[PDB]
Unconditional design. Structure first.
Length: 154
């Protein structure tokens, strides 16, 4: 019923790393780094792998900060997105043909050019809160309804 995905936010005290996808799902939007979890792979190992494939960074310590389930009306698979944060990385972000990374100051996060759910849960992420969320989309631009709550354990 649901498919596992990861999303990694490289969040430092003054800035956050986002990437703009060149093509495919999410193209033309800034987002964190992530993707499908593979067979026999833990969710955390999948998050570390996707961070490297999409941004070129090697994460040292990762922390779980959220779980968000996405429903797209007319699509059978729910997306079960496990959200992680890190401030401890190695490397320089790599621009590839697939992905353009950019650092953003925290007061200049480009919410108008991000998925619309981000405006709801990034405020929690920036205050070091953990969360569970659900968003029902119709198409890629419209949130029909949602739930979002802070939690002590993800």
């Amino acid at each position: 019923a649901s498919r596992l995905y990861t999303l990694v936010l490289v969040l430092q005290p003054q800035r956050v790393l986002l990437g703009m996808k060149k093509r495919g799902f999410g193209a033309g939007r800034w987002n964190g780094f992530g993707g499908k979890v593979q067979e026999g792979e833990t969710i955390e190992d999948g998050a570390r792998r996707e961070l490297q494939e999409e941004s070129g960074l090697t994460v040292d310590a990762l922390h779980k900060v959220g779980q968000i389930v996405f429903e797209f009306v007319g699509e059978p698979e729910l997306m079960d997105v496990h959200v992680f944060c890190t401030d401890s990385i190695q490397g320089t972000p790599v621009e590839s043909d697939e992905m353009r990374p950019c650092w953003f100051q925290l007061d200049q996060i480009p919410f108008k050019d991000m998925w619309p759910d981000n405006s709801y849960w990034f405020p929690l992420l920036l205050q070091k809160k953990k969360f569970h969320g659900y968003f029902k989309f119709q198409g890629q631009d419209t949130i029909l309804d949602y739930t979002l709550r802070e939690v002590d354990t993800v």
